[PDB]
Amino acid sequence: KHALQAIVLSDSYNYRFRPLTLDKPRCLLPLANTPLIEYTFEFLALAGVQEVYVFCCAHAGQIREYIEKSKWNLPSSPFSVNTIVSRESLSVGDALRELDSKQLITSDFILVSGDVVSNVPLNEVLKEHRKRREDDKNAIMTMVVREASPFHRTRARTESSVFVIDKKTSQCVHYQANERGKHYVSMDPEIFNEHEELEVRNDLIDCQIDICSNDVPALFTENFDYQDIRKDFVYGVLTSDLLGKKIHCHVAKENYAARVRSLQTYDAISKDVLSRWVYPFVPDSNLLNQTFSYQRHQIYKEEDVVLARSCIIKARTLIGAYTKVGDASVVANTIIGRNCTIGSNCSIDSAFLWEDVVIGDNCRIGKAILANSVKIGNNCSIEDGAIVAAGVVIGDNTIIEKNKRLTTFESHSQGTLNDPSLVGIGGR
């Protein structure tokens, strides 16, 4: 009832994005002209978190830094933020064991892997969690989930799971993640006897936003074989690998909640944010003192945006400040960062533009991410799935095929720089 704290496992999904994030961490990527971590913080602030620990590995320098000069390190901040640098591929549990070894956990804490976007107030979810625990100390964790439809566009594969819940006590008695190849749902009978009402739900979105008790970091040192909070911990609790413990669900029927854990979720959530689903967390709220203004058909423009006449920008389009768009250019369903330049006769549809991206005349761009200071030459075609990492310069009359990942760095992703750009890569 006092002093809650939250554990943010940043760096969880880095390398899922990687072409991007060979430059800046995943938690600092802009979703809709705003850093991905800011959403998580605004969520924890909404929850009333007093203390945050951000487990981070790659680019922890930048992360450490953003957090210092951010408003969350100011004295008026709702919670104190502390970073914990770990080694590569940090697991949930490895961090929990590290939390136990360092003895950092007081009370109940909110455990989150990656970055969340949510306007769901956890305050009442906490009260139910505390009241449940005040007579039963074996009630270990409350799983926050979102009511949805089976084929909901926000309900991806990780979120696609079957829950079997006691309709009154809201106790999860069964969990199995959906994976095609497995065509059955089966659980031992004896549950039936013990409960007397039971709801099997394939309509739930597993947000993996979890309220945990004091026991968890200690329980993860006791069970050192546990690495995933779902198929190791939850499975173990339900199969009694971890003795005599109770797991619980909270079904949110309102609001919004989701995690940016992949490219396709980053895309779908970006849509869900431009639609007012995560209100008040929308561009025109300007939490970082922007100048975003809402307009009809979900068009978000900052001040000092230069729109030439005969330029037409269609629905669900966001444009950062100091951005120029050329004559006869059509921008539809795309997000554009600060200080960009788009030439004449361009057609940009469902794409993503971060800061300082320059695009020359006569270009067709669609369903692609163009990181900071990416330059696109005249008469270029960028197709679906394309990921153009920061700094990359595409030469004139060049076509990037679907899904090609381009970078400016030392590794796996195809194609450095200099035009005309790959093929003909002037790539080191």
Partner: protein, 383 residues
């Protein structure tokens, strides 16, 4: 006047029960005639059907029970309603409801209400019929909370999709025991399903007429609770339906609605007593008291005995110091003089004598009992 065609025809199944073993080894008086409120078991499904508007019902009977059932129908059966009784030869113990329903398949022409003789139903008839009318399913089944057994069978597992009334799991809560599966194809369609072990099959069904020939051609379907299971509306289904979709529904509520298929004769009988003053038509003497209890006609009980919280049928006298408590008495029972019947069910035609003390004991038809106190037993007469 009779411009109106027949919407439903009612069929009631009265097999003779192997459960209620002490009560039913009889060819004397069948299961369907075992009294509840000093009225035969058959009275209540027939009363419910008559109040439902029905004027004609088909009673599938057992040929040994043929004679006696007919006998009660001509005289004793109150509800002014006509019952065509067909006891097909084919039916025998090694069978249950749906083959009995198949043996008379030619008699079924319209949509048909399928009831059991042990269906004690207080649920208002219109709610049942209107639901079948409004939803228009191929079949609708009624369920109810299990009985509470004030006194000192296998649980039912029912998974319905709330909010459509659709029924998606009907397997008994024993029987498949090892792993109790739910095929994932049922969670992409109908993603939200409520399960219940709290409910009991009320053996009340209403089928669209085409169902009767799913019974005709398919021979394996023995009983209805072994016939509703195989409805499946979601699966691969390569079973040659001739006859838009198939939809099976269920309904439940808080009222008296269950089956004396088990020992539940006792608890149903007990339940069956929201009533006012006890009938005049039997004589009981000063030097004795009964109250809150049911006594039927032409039973007599003389001085200093005790009838506490019990049921006494027609044709019986009781007397010389008897204490009967929480017990049930049927018919033709010469309660020898002075006994103790605490929590007992005695069958009709049964004589019990020379001080016989029975607790929690069930004693069969045409069975004398002499002295000889015992507690556990259901008894008896030999072989």
């Amino acid at each position: 006047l009779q411009s109106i065609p027949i919407e439903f025809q009612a069929v009631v199944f009265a097999g003779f029960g192997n459960s209620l073993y002490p009560l039913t080894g009889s060819d004397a008086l069948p299961k369907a005639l075992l009294p509840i409120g000093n009225k035969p078991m058959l009275h209540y499904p027939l009363y419910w059907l008559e109040a439902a508007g029905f004027t004609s019902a088909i009673l599938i009977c057992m040929e040994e029970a043929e004679a006696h059932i007919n006998a009660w129908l001509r005289s004793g059966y109150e509800g002014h309603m006509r019952i065509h009784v067909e006891a097909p030869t084919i039916l025998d113990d090694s069978k249950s409801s749906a083959d009995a329903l198949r043996a008379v398949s030619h008699l079924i022409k319209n949509d048909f209400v399928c009831l059991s003789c042990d269906s004690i139903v207080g649920l208002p008839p219109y709610t049942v019929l209107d639901k079948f009318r409004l939803d228009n399913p191929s079949a609708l089944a009624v369920y109810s909370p299990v009985l509470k057994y004030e006194h000192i069978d296998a649980k039912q597992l029912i998974g319905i999709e709330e909010k459509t009334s659709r029924l998606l799991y009907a397997k008994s809560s024993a029987d498949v025991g090892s792993d109790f599966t739910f095929r994932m194809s049922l969670l992409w369609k109908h993603p939200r399903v409520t399960l219940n072990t709290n409910l009991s099959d009320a053996h009340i069904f209403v089928f669209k007429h085409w169902v009767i020939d799913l019974i005709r051609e398919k021979e394996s379907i023995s009983s209805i609770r072994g016939d509703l299971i195989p409805y499946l509306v979601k699966c691969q289904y390569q079973k040659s339906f001739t006859v838009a979709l198939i939809a099976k529904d269920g309904i439940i509520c808080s009222r008296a609605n269950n089956l004396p298929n088990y020992f539940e004769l006792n608890k149903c009988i007990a339940k069956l007593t929201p009533e006012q003053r006890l009938v005049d038509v039997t004589v009981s003497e000063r030097a004795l008291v009964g109250a809150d209890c049911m006594v039927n006609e032409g039973t007599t009980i003389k001085d200093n005995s005790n009838i506490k919280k019990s049921i006494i049928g027609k044709n019986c006298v009781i007397g010389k110091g008897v204490v009967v408590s929480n017990s049930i008495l049927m018919d033709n029972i010469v309660v020898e003089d002075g006994v103790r019947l605490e929590s007992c069910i005695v069958a009709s035609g049964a004589q019990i004598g020379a001080k016989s003390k029975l607790r929690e004991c069930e004693i069969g038809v045409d069975h004398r009992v002499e002295a000889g106190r015992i507690a556990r037993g259901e008894r008896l007469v030999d072989m």
